[PDB]
RNA sequence: AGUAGAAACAAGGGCCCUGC
């Protein structure tokens, strides 16, 4: 339930988990930045198709 | 009955045992008494008697 | 890790498509549920046939591929196949396999570290097994059995809850990061959540399975069955092995599962508060609601609020009914007239007036119903099916098993129907004094005759005589009832029939919203009364264990212990949010400002005056030692603070800190004056009364975000505030804002400021200010 | 649930529910609006919050909960007292420290539209606050007190979660000012139809609706029409005692021949001892072949009866050859192709390629379904029933699982009774026939699954255990593999259920045939076999099966469950009436009628009457068809009549001749139906000596 | 198997709560009640599984 | 009667014997503990001493 | 041939695939 669509919810949760891990867990800034770039590109493609 | 020594299966066969919270033990410390918490066990058993 | 990146790549590839993008863009998240149905839909007519015809194949099962490679499960172990590289048509990521492969795994496959967690996942069924082992069977005998059909519960269950209260409980124990806003059931039942959480944490588990099993652990399975003997969930769970229509496997099963004891305790408490509130004359309604909400009780290990148990129970008794009525709780359509029980099967009617002369000429109004109606009726071990017609008991049939019960059931039915001449001309024995108004409260003539019967057995004999007596016709000799309650006689009562074999309790899965008056008599959209205060026992003395009537009217302690307890309550209420409260001071390490609180200043007069200096030294030491470092126990400062008000001095500290009434507290050990436990860390017990500590800060013991939820609240959304997780949520400052993701597809903004007020008062008061 | 009030009571205070309920009753609006109002009302309430002013007096004064007239009275009173201008519309709350009304709004849509409409409606007269369930705020003045905002937003968040969970967070339950009229979108075509589907006297749905909405009861015309209909009907009522039942008329013609796939009474078997190593069927069929008896057989070209003897002879030779090669397969030649019906499936001819000349060339009339033809009472059925009742010199024919442990007397009782009964039944002949069916059909089912499109060879066998003598002699009696014949399948491509795969049956016997019974078979004189020497015959035929018959025959142990049920019921019923174990007594003493001999009745203890019921249940399993279905469905009416006759309940019926006709309609060429019909006639005859309602 | 313990009470594994002796309440029925008042027994709550 | 007997399978109630057991490996510890001296004292009451 | 019932089966799709 909620007010977000599916794409919005997915994106937001992925960014949150990326931070949650990079803060303490086994993740590097390089990996974090790569993940964030992938996600912003995915959002652009989703919103651009139509 | 109350006890502060966990059981072994061989010596204590007729007994059903539980663990009832904790309790306290009191011992000297210089000129005062102090208290150190320990667990507590409850030993339950049935038996007969006569006159 | 790498998996996270893989999920991100997968989402990107999927968004590159065109249709997938549209479907992931339109609507809210709820669509997931819909999409979950349009896929993988395929059934079969006769699965037995297809199982015998499918298992006859070579590779009839599917299975994961990567899991088999990782487990190093070979193929063709000993000339017997185990699987082959292929792709099932539906999954496309599974590979065909054979049944033998399963056995291979079970015998020489990968082993998990431990599996005793299973005993917790399936607690209900291991509970069945354990209860069974403690049964002592007996001989078997043959005879016919009188099995009555009725609705019962087959699952012994502690803390029966609702469904909305489980769907959330399944989240805070298993999927906590995806948990929604904290609901009232959570904040109130904290120890319960902590308990269910301690077992299923840091364990290898399949969570869908665990979640379903939790639903089963909290369900009383209600069934409409034939039944014989006592009614207890422990028997109903194994009724199949206790008796049928022609045999009985005797066995004693009395001392197991302790269910009905809790229910009888609840009813005793309800009777207590109902009578107490009845003591009033003008506010029995508000008095009763207040007494209810101001009470608590222990259930097994957990502490529950009374008003929460009352809205969960199903005891159709004239006491539970009133309470459930005051609290606006819907309930079933079961009547009650004194000790008996009643339930309407068919018919209708409407009130009508009539009068009777008590002594000589003294007109007294009493009502009756002007139509025909049919009723099931139940007294102890006796059943009846009767009909009333315009102030008359038309017919009645009985299926009980005792003469005494038969006579009493018949008599209470005659009264319930206003049948007889007594309702036309009352007896001489009754007078205007016995009429009504113990202290002003009238009494309808019905209950008057009721108590007149319960007073002396000879009144009951006379009332039965009020029913016509005649000579037993031929043939009907067996189905006739005398005055003694004998299955046959030469002269029997009129229009009465007996039989062996109880009557089937009717059934209806209906609910009704009733109300009540200022005299505590509930009504149901009609002039009919379903419950009252005259149909329950007069009085009795009882010693309740594990109960908390933290309300003035319901208290027996002296002003001294009450003063201590109220001081502790006031001192805890300062545990909220905002500066000047103890959490902020601890955070700032201002251990000095605590000594100067006003609350300690109100408890100061209670300290032993001749040694107030010595205690002060010791007390301050503990506090500073705990605050300067950060390793403190929130339940210990709240205990010793009241002693830090005076100035330190020198002397020998025995080990205890005494008040002025020879009641002490000892710093480190639980005693009668101040107790608490790591199991339920949200309670403080003072002189038995319980005190609820708010959930604003969490010390070393409390170990999750569960302990912070009463400190946050929602506010107007602000895009400037930062966005954080649920774990960094502890590092915010009192009064700050932060955005956060809640449940699924939802983002909000919270502010670390609490609001102790509720809606009950803000609604009730403003309402009463409208009836003027 | 069950009402919007009950739903709303979930997240509101029951008080606000009662208020909003009385309000909707006042305006008479759709009660689905109990929810919005309660929510709105509670917000206003918790906005008051019992705050106080500088003068120690209340600061806010609610006016929403009140009636409309009273609300207008207070609004004007306050506009006058504090010397304020009267407003055109009503408001929700009024404060005193500022002396200006305040209006509260709520909405779900994340846009200012609701606040724009309200601000246009009221301009800047008073203070307006519109909150959103998703955390937004729009106003025309300074913000409220902090605590007010926190409490309100928190409440609205909980409410939104609850509603979204109940699927009620929609325009329906939470509409704006405009979208408050929900209605079925009656289109154009649908209305055109509804006014056309009306009953006769009316011609437009409006007339019918007005006639139904105002219909009043007139009991007298109803009674008149009821009586009139009661007179032109003349329902017959026929007490059976006066109108008795004729006998049932079985059909006429030849006798119904043997139909079960396997032989039961004429079957002969070769036995050997079983070794656990060689246990499959395809192996047992070879072990029996090595000892040499199976190869001594050699039928001749002259059959005692039947047709197509050459094909059967060649097929038997190929069967022996295939067994000798250790590969249970047969080739597709002219013989096997003819007996297995390989290529005799119709050929398709699309109509698009059809013409009148084609039809006239080769007549293409519609297929004339040729329903079955009748038969007569079978006279060989009673012989089978008496043969399947006796012991068989061996036991353990039907495999069974083990007994679990026991802990209470009940389970001891259960084990004991179950052991006695199973020991009685496992020794009969009906049991060996059940075991034969179980194992042979299991083998055929497996083959059909693995080797379709291939003619195979499957034995007809069984496994048993020789009986237990006393401890004397050789102890530990041995096991046995028995072989009754050979079976052959033919390309069982069961692409779809209910299909058919023909099979062929070569069986061994020592009893010559009868033309009436063994009509379908093609018997041959094979040679000799021992016992002294005795002739041997070879019964051969062709038949079929399907997925369903396979599945059901393999599950032929249900007969035990039913039989045990009947017996145990009788015993416990007799034991309960006396409150004592009368189980052994009831089994050894209570006698049951079985049949007639020399015109007298016969009876025997329950312990020995079980076998009749068991055989009845097995035959139900074997000969079941639609005919037997209909018959067993129509005989209950007669038995209920019989019971009413036994207990002096004066039965009656409406048309008994029609019942007898329905029964006799389903009697055609089915040995079980015909047999049971003759026996039902005889039952009513034999009872007529003791009861009425039956004619002779 | 080894011979198990038999005496009625426990000797070595025992434990005892203590309190000061009052000559006016020197009876079993009274001693037990007093021991219960200070609330150390009511706190003994055995868990379900032994 | 005889039928009742045959029905219930009545027989003479078999008498059980105590099973033999091994040597206890906890007796010496109990003896040792018993010989020690208790913190409290005066457990057993006795009468007085005449002149 | 045969089966079964009040119509269907006695392979079906593209040499290969399969059995709801």
Swiss-Prot record, chain A:
Provide the record's note on post-translational modification: Phosphorylated by host PRKCA.
Tell me where it resides: Host nucleus; Host cytoplasm
**Oligomeric state and partners?**
Influenza RNA polymerase is composed of three subunits: PB1, PB2 and PA. Interacts (via N-terminus) with PA (via C-terminus). Interacts (via C-terminus) with PB2 (via N-terminus); this interaction is essential for transcription initiation.
Q: Of which family is this protein a member?
A: Belongs to the influenza viruses polymerase PB1 family.
Q: What is the documented function of this protein?
A: RNA-dependent RNA polymerase which is responsible for replication and transcription of virus RNA segments. The transcription of viral mRNAs occurs by a unique mechanism called cap-snatching. 5' methylated caps of cellular mRNAs are cleaved after 10-13 nucleotides by PA. In turn, these short capped RNAs are used as primers by PB1 for transcription of viral mRNAs. During virus replication, PB1 initiates RNA synthesis and copy vRNA into complementary RNA (cRNA) which in turn serves as a template for the production of more vRNAs.
What's the name of the protein? Answer: RNA-directed RNA polymerase catalytic subunit
This chain's source organism reads Influenza C virus (strain C/Johannesburg/1/1966)
Lineage here is: Viruses, Riboviria, Orthornavirae, Negarnaviricota, Polyploviricotina
Shown portion of the complete protein runs from 705 to 754 of 754
From Swiss-Prot, chain C:
Gene Ontology terms: cellular component: host cell nucleus; virion component
Q: What is its main location?
A: virion
The organism's superkingdom is given as Viruses
Q: For this UniProt entry, which segments traverse the membrane? A: none
A GO biological-process term: DNA-templated transcription
Pfam families under this entry?
Flu_PB2_1st (PF20947), Flu_PB2_2nd (PF20948), Flu_PB2_3rd (PF20949), Flu_PB2_4th (PF20950), Flu_PB2_5th (PF00604), Flu_PB2_6th (PF20951), Flu_PB2_7th (PF20952)
- Record-level Gene Ontology MF annotations: RNA binding; RNA-directed RNA polymerase activity
Q: Does the keyword Cell division apply?
A: no
Is-annotated flag, keyword Transmembrane helix?
Answer: no
List where in the cell it is found. Answer: Virion; Host nucleus
Its keywords, alphabetically, are: Cap snatching, Eukaryotic host gene expression shutoff by virus, Eukaryotic host transcription shutoff by virus, Host gene expression shutoff by virus, Host nucleus, Host-virus interaction, Inhibition of host RNA polymerase II by virus, mRNA capping, mRNA processing, Viral transcription, Virion
Q: How does it assemble?
A: Influenza RNA polymerase is composed of three subunits: PB1, PB2 and PA. Interacts (via N-terminus) with PB1 (via C-terminus). Interacts with nucleoprotein NP (via N-terminus). Interacts with host ANP32A (via C-terminus); this interaction promotes viral RNA synthesis.
Tell me the protein family, please: Belongs to the influenza viruses PB2 family.
What is this protein's function?
Answer: Plays an essential role in transcription initiation and cap-stealing mechanism, in which cellular capped pre-mRNAs are used to generate primers for viral transcription. Recognizes and binds a wide range of cap structures of target pre-RNAs which are subsequently cleaved after 10-13 nucleotides by the viral protein PA. Plays a role in the initiation of the viral genome replication and modulates the activity of the ribonucleoprotein (RNP) complex.
Protein name per Swiss-Prot or TrEMBL? Polymerase basic protein 2
Source species taxonomy: Viruses, Riboviria, Orthornavirae, Negarnaviricota, Polyploviricotina
Gene name, per UniProt, is PB2
UniProtKB/Swiss-Prot annotation, chain E:
**What post-translational modification does the entry describe?**
Phosphorylated on serines and threonines by host kinases, including human casein kinase II.
Q: Which domain of life is it from?
A: Viruses
Compartmental location: Host cytoplasm; Host nucleus
What this chain does, per the entry, is described as:
Plays an essential role in viral RNA transcription and replication by forming the heterotrimeric polymerase complex together with PB1 and PB2 subunits. The complex transcribes viral mRNAs by using a unique mechanism called cap-snatching. It consists in the hijacking and cleavage of host capped pre-mRNAs. These short capped RNAs are then used as primers for viral mRNAs. The PB2 subunit is responsible for the binding of the 5' cap of cellular pre-mRNAs which are subsequently cleaved after 10-13 nucleotides by the PA subunit that carries the endonuclease activity.
The family this protein is said to belong to: Belongs to the influenza viruses PA family.
The record's note on quaternary structure and interaction partners says: Influenza RNA polymerase is composed of three subunits: PB1, PB2 and PA. Interacts (via C-terminus) with PB1 (via N-terminus).
- Name of the protein: Polymerase acidic protein
Instruction: Tell me what gene encodes this.
Output: PA
Parent-record interval covered: 255 to 304 of 709
């Amino acid at each position: 339930i909620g007010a977000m669509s599916i794409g919005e919810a997915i994106e937001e949760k992925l960014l949150e988990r990326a931070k949650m891990k990079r803060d303490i867990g086994a993740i590097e800034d390089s990996e974090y930045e790569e993940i964030k770039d992938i996600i912003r590109d995915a959002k652009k493609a989703r919103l651009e198709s139509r | 009955e109350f006890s502060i020594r966990e059981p072994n299966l061989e010596k204590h066969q007729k007994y059903t045992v539980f663990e009832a919270g904790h309790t306290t033990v009191r011992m000297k410390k210089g000129e005062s008494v102090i208290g150190r918490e320990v667990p507590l066990y409850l030993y339950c058993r049935t038996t007969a008697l006569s006159k | 890790m790498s998996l996270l990146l893989t999920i991100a790549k997968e989402y990107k590839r999927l968004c590159q498509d065109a249709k997938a993008a549209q479907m992931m863009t339109v609507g809210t998240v709820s669509n997931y549920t819909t999409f979950k149905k349009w896929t993988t839909s395929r059934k079969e007519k006769n699965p037995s046939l297809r199982m015998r015809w499918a298992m006859s194949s070579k590779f009839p099962i599917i299975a994961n591929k990567r899991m088999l490679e990782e487990a190093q499960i070979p193929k063709e172990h000993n000339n017997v196949a185990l699987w082959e590289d292929t792709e099932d048509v539906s999954k496309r990521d599974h590979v065909l396999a054979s049944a033998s492969c399963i056995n291979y795994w079970n015998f020489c496959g990968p082993c998990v570290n431990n599996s005793e967690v299973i005993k917790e996942v399936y607690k209900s069924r291991f509970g069945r097994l354990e209860r069974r082992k403690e049964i002592m069977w007996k001989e078997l005998r043959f005879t016919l059995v009188d099995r009555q059909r009725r609705r019962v519960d087959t699952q012994p269950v502690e803390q029966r809850l609702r469904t909305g209260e489980i769907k959330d409980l399944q989240m805070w124990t298993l999927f906590e990061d995806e948990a929604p806003l904290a609901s009232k059931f959570i904040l109130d039942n904290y120890g319960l959540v902590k308990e269910m959480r301690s077992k299923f944490a840091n364990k290898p588990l399949n969570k869908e399975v665990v979640a379903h099993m939790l639903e089963k652990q909290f369900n009383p399975e209600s069934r409409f069955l034939p039944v014989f003997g006592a009614i207890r969930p422990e028997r109903m769970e194994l009724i199949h092995a206790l008796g049928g229509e022609t045999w009985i496997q005797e066995a004693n099963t009395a001392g197991i599962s302790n269910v009905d004891q809790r229910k009888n305790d609840i009813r005793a408490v309800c009777r207590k508060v109902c009578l107490a509130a009845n003591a009033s004359i003008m506010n029995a309604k508000s008095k009763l609601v207040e007494y209810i909400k101001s009470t608590s009780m222990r259930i097994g290990e957990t502490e529950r609020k009374l008003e929460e148990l009352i809205l969960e129970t199903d005891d159709v008794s004239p006491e539970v009914t009133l309470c459930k009525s005051a609290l606006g709780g819907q309930l079933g359509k079961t009547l009650s007239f004194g000790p008996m029980l009643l339930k309407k099967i068919s018919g209708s009617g409407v009130k009508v007036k009539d009068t009777v002369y008590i002594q000589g000429v003294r007109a007294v109004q009493f009502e009756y119903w002007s139509e025909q109606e049919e009723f099931y009726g139940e007294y102890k071990s006796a059943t009846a099916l009767f009909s009333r017609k315009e102030r008359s008991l038309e017919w009645i049939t009985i299926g009980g098993g005792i003469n005494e019960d038969r006579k009493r059931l018949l008599a209470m039915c005659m009264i319930f129907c206003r049948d007889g001449d007594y309702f036309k001309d009352a007896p001489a024995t009754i007078t205007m004094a016995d009429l009504s108004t113990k202290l002003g409260r009238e009494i309808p003539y019905q209950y008057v005759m009721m108590n007149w019967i319960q007073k002396s057995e000879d009144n009951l004999e006379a009332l039965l005589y009020s029913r016509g007596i005649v000579e037993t016709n031929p043939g009907k000799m067996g189905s006739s009832m005398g005055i003694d309650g004998s299955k046959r006689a030469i002269k029997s009562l009129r229009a009465v029939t007996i039989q062996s074999g109880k009557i089937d309790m009717p059934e209806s899965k209906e609910k009704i919203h009733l109300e009540l008056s200022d005299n505590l008599e509930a009504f149901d959209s009609s002039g009919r009364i379903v419950a009252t205060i005259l149909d329950l026992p007069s009085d009795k003395k009882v010693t309740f264990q594990d109960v908390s009537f933290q309300h003035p009217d319901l208290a027996v302690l002296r002003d001294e212990k009450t003063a201590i307890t109220k001081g502790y309550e006031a001192l805890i209420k300062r545990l909220g949010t905002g500066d000047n409260d103890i959490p902020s001071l601890i955070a700032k390490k201002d251990y000095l400002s605590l000594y100067n609180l006003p609350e300690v200043k109100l408890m100061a007069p209670l300290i032993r005056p001749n040694r107030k200096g010595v205690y002060s030294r010791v007390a301050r030491k503990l506090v500073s030692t705990q605050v300067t470092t950060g390793h403190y126990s929130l339940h210990e400062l709240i205990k010793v603070l009241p002693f830090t008000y005076f100035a330190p001095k020198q002397g020998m500290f025995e080990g205890r800190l005494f008040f002025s009434n020879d009641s002490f507290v000892e710093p480190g050990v639980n005693n009668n004056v101040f107790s608490w436990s790591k199991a339920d860390s949200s309670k403080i017990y003072c002189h038995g009364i319980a005190i609820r500590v708010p959930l604003v800060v969490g010390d070393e013991h409390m170990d999750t975000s569960l302990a912070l939820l009463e400190g946050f609240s929602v506010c107007e959304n602000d895009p400037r505030a930062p966005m954080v997780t649920r774990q960094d949520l502890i590092d915010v400052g009192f009064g700050q804002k932060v955005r956060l993701f809640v449940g699924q597809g939802s983002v909000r903004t919270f502010k670390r400021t609490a609001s102790q007020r509720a809606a009950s008062s803000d609604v009730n008061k403003n309402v009463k200010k409208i009836k003027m | 649930s069950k009402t919007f009030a009950e739903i709303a009571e979930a997240f509101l205070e029951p008080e606000a529910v009662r208020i909003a309920k009385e309000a909707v009753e006042e305006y008479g609006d759709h009660e689905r609006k109990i929810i919005q109002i309660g929510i709105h009302f509670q917000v206003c309430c918790m906005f008051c919050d019992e705050y106080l002013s500088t003068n120690g007096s209340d600061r806010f004064v609610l006016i929403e909960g009140r009636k409309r007239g009273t609300a207008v009275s207070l609004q004007n009173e306050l506009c006058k007292s504090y010397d304020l201008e009267p407003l055109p519309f009503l408001c929700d709350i009024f404060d005193r420290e500022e002396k200006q009304f305040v209006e509260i709004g709520i909405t779900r849509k994340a846009d200012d539209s609701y606040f724009q409409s309200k601000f246009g409606k009221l301009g800047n007269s008073c203070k307006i606050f519109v909150f959103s369930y998703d955390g937004r705020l729009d106003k025309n003045c300074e913000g409220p007190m902090e605590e007010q905002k926190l409490r309100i937003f928190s409440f609205l968040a909980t409410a939104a979660d609850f509603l979204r969970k109940e699927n009620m967070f929609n325009e329906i339950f939470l509409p704006d000012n405009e979208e408050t009229i929900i209605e079925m979108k009656k289109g154009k075509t649908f209305l055109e139809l509804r006014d056309e589907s009306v009953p006769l006297p009316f011609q437009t749905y409006e007339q019918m609706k007005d006639y139904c909405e105002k219909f009043k009861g007139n009991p007298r015309e109803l009674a008149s029409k009821v009586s009139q209909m009661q007179s032109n009907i003349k329902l017959p009522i026929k007490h059976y005692e006066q109108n008795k039942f004729r006998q049932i008329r079985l059909p006429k013609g030849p006798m119904a021949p043997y139909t079960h796939k396997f032989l039961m009474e004429e079957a002969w078997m070769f036995t050997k001892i079983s070794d656990p190593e060689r246990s499959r069927a395809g192996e047992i069929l070879i072990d029996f072949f090595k000892k040499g008896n199976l190869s001594a057989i050699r039928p001749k070209d002259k059959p005692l009866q039947g047709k197509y003897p050459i094909h059967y002879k060649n097929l038997w030779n190929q069967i022996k050859a295939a067994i000798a090669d250790r590969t249970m397969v047969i080739n597709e030649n002219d013989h096997s192709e003819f007996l297995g019906g390989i290529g005799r499936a119709s050929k398709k001819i699309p109509e698009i390629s059809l013409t009148q000349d084609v039809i006239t060339t080769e007549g293409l009339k519609q297929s004339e379904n040729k329903l079955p033809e009748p038969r007569s009472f079978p006279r060989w059925f009673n012989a089978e029933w008496m043969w399947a009742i006796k012991d068989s010199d061996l036991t353990g024919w039907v495999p069974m699982a083990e007994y679990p442990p026991a802990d209470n007397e009940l389970e001891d009782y259960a084990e004991h009774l179950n052991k006695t009964m199973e020991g009685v039944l496992q020794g009969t002949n009906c049991a060996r026939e059940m075991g034969k069916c179980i194992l042979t059909v299991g083998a055929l089912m497996t083959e059909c699954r693995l080797f379709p499109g291939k003619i195979k060879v499957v034995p007809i066998y069984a496994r048993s255990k020789e009986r237990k003598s006393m401890q004397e002699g050789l102890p530990v009696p041995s096991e046995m593999d028995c072989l009754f014949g050979i079976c052959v399948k033919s390309k069982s491509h069961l692409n779809k259920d209910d299909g058919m795969y023909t099979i062929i049956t070569f069986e061994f016997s020592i009893r010559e045939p009868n033309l009436e019974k063994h009509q379908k078979y093609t018997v041959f004189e094979a040679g000799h076999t021992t016992v002294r020497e005795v002739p041997l015959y070879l019964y051969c035929r062709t038949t079929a099966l399907s997925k369903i018959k396979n599945d059901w025959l393999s599950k032929a142990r249900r007969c035990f469950i039913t039989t045990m049920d009947t017996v145990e019921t009788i015993c416990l019923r007799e034991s309960a009436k006396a409150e004592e174990n009368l189980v052994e007594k009831t089994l050894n003493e209570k006698q049951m009628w079985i049949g007639k001999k020399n015109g007298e009745l016969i009876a025997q203890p329950l312990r020995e009457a079980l076998r009749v019921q068991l055989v009845q249940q097995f035959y139900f399993c074997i000969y079941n068809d639609s005919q037997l279905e209909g018959f067993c469905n129509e005989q209950k009416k007669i038995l209920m009549a019989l019971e009413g006759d036994k207990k002096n309940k004066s039965s009656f019926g409406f048309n008994p001749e029609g019942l007898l006709e329905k029964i006799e309609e389903c009697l055609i060429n089915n040995p079980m139906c015909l047999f049971m019909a003759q026996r039902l006639n005889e039952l009513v005859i034999e009872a007529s000596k003791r009861g009425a309602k039956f004619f002779k």
